[PDB]
Design a protein around this nucleic acid. Structure first.
Ligand SMILES: [Mg+2]
Ligand SMILES: [Mg+2]
Ligand SMILES: [Mg+2]
Ligand SMILES: [Mg+2]
Ligand SMILES: [Mg+2]
Ligand SMILES: [Mg+2]
Ligand SMILES: [Mg+2]
Ligand SMILES: [Mg+2]
Ligand SMILES: [Mg+2]
Ligand SMILES: [Mg+2]
Ligand SMILES: [Mg+2]
Ligand SMILES: [Mg+2]
Ligand SMILES: [Mg+2]
Ligand SMILES: [Mg+2]
Ligand SMILES: [Mg+2]
Ligand SMILES: [Mg+2]
Ligand SMILES: [Mg+2]
Ligand SMILES: [Mg+2]
Ligand SMILES: [Mg+2]
Ligand SMILES: [Mg+2]
Ligand SMILES: [Mg+2]
Ligand SMILES: [Mg+2]
Ligand SMILES: [Mg+2]
Ligand SMILES: [Mg+2]
Ligand SMILES: [Mg+2]
Ligand SMILES: [Mg+2]
Ligand SMILES: [Mg+2]
Ligand SMILES: [Mg+2]
Ligand SMILES: [Mg+2]
Ligand SMILES: [Mg+2]
Ligand SMILES: [Mg+2]
Ligand SMILES: [Mg+2]
Ligand SMILES: [Mg+2]
Ligand SMILES: [Mg+2]
Ligand SMILES: [Mg+2]
Ligand SMILES: [Mg+2]
Ligand SMILES: [Zn+2]
Lengths: 214, 37, 60, 146, 176
RNA sequence: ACCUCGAUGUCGGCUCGUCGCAUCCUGGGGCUGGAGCAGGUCCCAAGGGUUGGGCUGUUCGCCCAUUAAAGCGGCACGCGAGCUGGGUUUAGAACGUCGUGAGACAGUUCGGUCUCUAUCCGCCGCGCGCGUCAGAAGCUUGAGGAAACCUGUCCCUAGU
RNA sequence: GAUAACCGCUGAAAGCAUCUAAGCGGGAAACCUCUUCCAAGACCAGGCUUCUCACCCUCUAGGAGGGAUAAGGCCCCCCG
């Protein structure tokens, strides 16, 4: 029903079309993934599949985590995350210890990507929320770039909780929707995303079958 | 839909009925149908 | 009122019956008894219902 | 000196009440009276003296009039213009227990002792309950005649 | 009320079973069930008549007596014989046809219009200009009639659209 | 003239919004003196959006070119412990008028110091302590909050 | 999915008639989900596994105080 798989961004490039065009493509290394858990509604309250990825030496992994992996029946992995299903028909095909690779996706189908946006730092109001600066001339008095007025006076005499102003951006989960997959492989699990996805080089991204059009 | 607080049986055949606390007049003559509101 | 409702009578009816019976005991002692002797309340409510008239809605 | 409750002289009991076809106002008023404990002669307002009360079948509450569509339950999340509107019909369709919970919390004291009394009310929707281990005594609301 | 005083006759080839407040009708054309209002009671006269009774002379009983009587009469007569409503498709370039249980209407739209036929209703086309619907429940027959009629907006100028057998739409013309 | 003359800073512009619907478009309906398009009017509807310029300190207003529109209002005629002093609103000078005269003129014309290192509430983000009942690591379901919600043109049906 | 306005069906009070008071329904950028993020400090503080699951002393035997441990954590290092 709904497919998904984890991946890693290493670069971002372009590839050529059969319609003779050129399309930018994001390198996504969807390395091999192993099923470490199954979630059943009667025993837990929902249906989902938990996946682990990466290679970590057995001594760098925390001992309870290593024990949990041994109980699951697979060697230790780097990061762990789950994919949520919606019916037990898709649940029944997944079993503990099963291995998933990138060929499960067929080219021509939209995909959705989820990752952590870049760490931009504590930024000003105008850069963050796209405000407009005032004149840097005509007698400005050191308020060149700072927002200014916030609300009424003595009624309500406050700020309107939720007002858009200064704060740190980035370093949070961000999703991009309805993306081309241009080309997939079977050899070493490399998946291609036409466009630009959020995250970092050598960062963590998860790709899921598109909900919008699929 | 002539919406006005006062509604009357304009012709000899317009008919007044009651719906959801609003009384409206209906007639096969199209304009004679209105609600009071 | 709590004790009266436990003994299946209302506060107003209990007080009116008590006044009709002519008992001058005050709410301090009634409350201490309610904390203390449900036997005392059983006797008291019995007296109150005995002193209660036939019909409460009579024009009298 | 008058009587006041001591540390451990307080006693608790477990009551279970079915809510099938019972009027919301009457049921909730009786429940509030029971949780405050006005049924014991050892009532004292500065300490809790009531009993634990469990209500069953919160989705079977019956209310009179056309309020099934013309009564609204209001709350505001916090932002300006964040006022949101839902009806009793939608409330029982989505979370049946919320209506009884709100009705009872509305008549309990709105102080910290009141919300401490609120701590001891169990409200469920289904006909079963995992508190059969405490052998609650079934309770039927009755009126004294005079 | 006034009609409710008149008992509903029961034809011989119709079986009626009653259990408390729920009532059902058995006949050649099928089975149907309904529930009647609580305050009023209904009884089966031994001579083959339906007797409906109201307990008081109050508003609800007075209203519901006639409602129950006429509903039961309609139910029993529809179950014994049945119900047909026929329509006329007048206009130019207007085409109607039936395949299987579905109906396709070429009503001038750029896309074809398909309507799914509910359970317990039948459709039969005689001409591409007029067809008829046959069924057992006045509720479903009227529901289908209204649904079909509401495909086209009223046209008081050219008579374009759909209408029943005797339905008349007033004629009006503009000089401009 | 009831609060403020042991101080409630004033019009406009910039930035920043919020709320109501008596709605500008977009959405759904009733009627026509609605052949069709093209209309007029009334109802429901606040989800979203609602031009840029020339002129003047302007608000307003006139004009220029589109779009779907270039909404009405409330929020100390929103907002100077956020910014501007263009005018009103000091001290110069001058014009015209009034007054024999000092001076004045909701008449005009030129330039004329806008201070404050955030205590609390509030807010945008990030941290320390504590409990969730032996102690720890993961994955989480999720009540409950937030974000977003706009739209134009062309071709077929059919020049029927 | 339920609704505003609107359009219906069988229908009486009132032999008729009637979208409605019993009932059965269609019906929009509004409303509830569907999309995305936060989210068990949600005090009903939720759920499933994994890991160490016993060494004492003291006051006086009612409990309490102090020490010695594992899993794990922290410090510190190079850094992003
Ligand atoms: Mg940006
Ligand atoms: Mg700028
Ligand atoms: Mg500067
Ligand atoms: Mg208070
Ligand atoms: Mg005064
Ligand atoms: Mg004063
Ligand atoms: Mg001052
Ligand atoms: Mg001010
Ligand atoms: Mg000012
Ligand atoms: Mg309006
Ligand atoms: Mg319109
Ligand atoms: Mg009009
Ligand atoms: Mg509006
Ligand atoms: Mg919106
Ligand atoms: Mg200008
Ligand atoms: Mg305002
Ligand atoms: Mg102001
Ligand atoms: Mg404002
Ligand atoms: Mg203002
Ligand atoms: Mg300041
Ligand atoms: Mg300040
Ligand atoms: Mg001047
Ligand atoms: Mg000035
Ligand atoms: Mg001067
Ligand atoms: Mg002169
Ligand atoms: Mg002179
Ligand atoms: Mg002089
Ligand atoms: Mg100068
Ligand atoms: Mg100044
Ligand atoms: Mg300063
Ligand atoms: Mg400060
Ligand atoms: Mg939620
Ligand atoms: Mg009628
Ligand atoms: Mg009719
Ligand atoms: Mg917890
Ligand atoms: Mg350690
Ligand atoms: Zn008329």
């Amino acid at each position: 029903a709904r497919k998904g798989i984890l991946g890693t961004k290493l670069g971002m490039t372009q590839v050529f079309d059969e319609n003779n065009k050129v399309v930018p493509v994001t390198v996504v290394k969807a390395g091999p993934n192993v099923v470490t858990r199954i979630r059943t509604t009667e025993r837990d309250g929902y249906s989902a599949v938990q996946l682990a990825y990466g290679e970590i030496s057995p001594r760098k992994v925390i001992k309870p985590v290593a024990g949990q992996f041994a109980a699951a029946g697979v060697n230790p992995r780097r990061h762990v995350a789950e994919l949520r299903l919606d019916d037990e028909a898709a649940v029944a095909e997944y079993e503990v210890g099963q291995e998933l690779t990138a060929e499960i996706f067929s080219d021509g189908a939209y995909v959705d990507v989820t990752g952590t946006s870049k760490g931009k730092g504590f930024a000003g109001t105008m850069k963050r929320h796209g405000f407009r600066g005032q004149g840097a001339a005509h007698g400005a008095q050191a308020v060149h770039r700072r927002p200014g007025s916030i609300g009424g006076c003595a009624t309500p005499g406050r700020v309107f909780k939720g007002t858009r102003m200064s704060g740190r951006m980035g370093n949070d989960r961000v999703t991009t929707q309805n993306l081309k997959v241009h080309k997939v492989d079977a050899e070493n699990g490399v998946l291609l995303i036409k466009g630009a996805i959020p995250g970092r080089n050598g960062g963590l991204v998860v790709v899921r079958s598109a909900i919008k059009r699929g | 839909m002539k919406v006005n607080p006062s509604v009357k049986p304009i012709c000899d055949k317009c008919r007044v009925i009651r719906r959801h606390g609003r009384v409206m007049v209906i007639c096969s003559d199209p304009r004679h149908k209105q609600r009071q509101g | 009122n709590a004790a009266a409702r436990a003994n299946d009578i209302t506060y107003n009816r209990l007080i009116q019956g008590l006044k009709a019976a002519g008992v001058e005991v005050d709410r301090k002692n009634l409350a201490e008894l309610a904390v203390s002797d449900p036997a005392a309340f059983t006797a008291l409510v019995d007296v109150a219902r005995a002193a209660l008239p036939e019909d409460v809605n009579a024009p009298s | 000196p008058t009587y006041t409750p001591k540390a451990g002289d307080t006693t608790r009991s477990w009551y279970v009440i079915d809510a099938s076809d019972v009027v919301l106002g009457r049921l909730a008023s009786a429940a509030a009276t029971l949780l405050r404990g006005k049924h014991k002669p050892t009532f004292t307002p500065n300490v809790d003296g009531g009993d634990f009360v469990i209500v069953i079948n919160a989705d079977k509450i019956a209310v009179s009039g056309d309020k099934l569509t013309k009564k609204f339950a209001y709350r505001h999340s916090g932002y300006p213009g964040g006022l949101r509107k839902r009806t009793i019909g939608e409330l029982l369709e989505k979370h049946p227990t919320r209506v009884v919970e709100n009705a009872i919390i509305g008549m309990l004291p709105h102080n910290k002792l009141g919300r401490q009394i609120q701590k001891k009310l169990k409200v469920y929707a289904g006909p079963d309950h995992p508190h059969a281990a405490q052998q609650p005594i079934p309770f039927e609301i009755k009126q004294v005649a005079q | 009320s006034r009609i409710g005083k008149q008992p509903v006759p029961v034809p011989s080839g119709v079986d009626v079973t009653i259990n408390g407040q729920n009532l059902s009708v058995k006949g050649p054309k099928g089975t149907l069930t309904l529930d009647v209002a609580e305050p009023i009671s209904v009884s089966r006269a031994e001579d083959g008549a339906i007797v409906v009774t109201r307990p008081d002379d109050e508003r609800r009983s007075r209203s519901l007596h006639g409602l129950s009587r006429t509903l039961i009469a309609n139910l029993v007569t529809g179950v014994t014989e049945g119900y047909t409503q026929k329509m006329e498709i007048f206009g130019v370039g207007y085409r109607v046809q039936l395949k299987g249980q579905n109906l396709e209407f070429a009503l001038g739209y750029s896309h074809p219009v398909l309507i799914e036929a509910p359970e317990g209703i039948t459709f039969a086309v005689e001409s591409p200009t007029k067809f008829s619907v046959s069924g057992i429940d006045k509720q479903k027959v009227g529901q289908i009639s209204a649904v079909i009629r509401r495909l086209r907006r009223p046209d008081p100028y050219k008579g374009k659209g759909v209408r029943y057998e005797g339905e008349q739409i007033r004629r009006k013309v503009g000089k401009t």
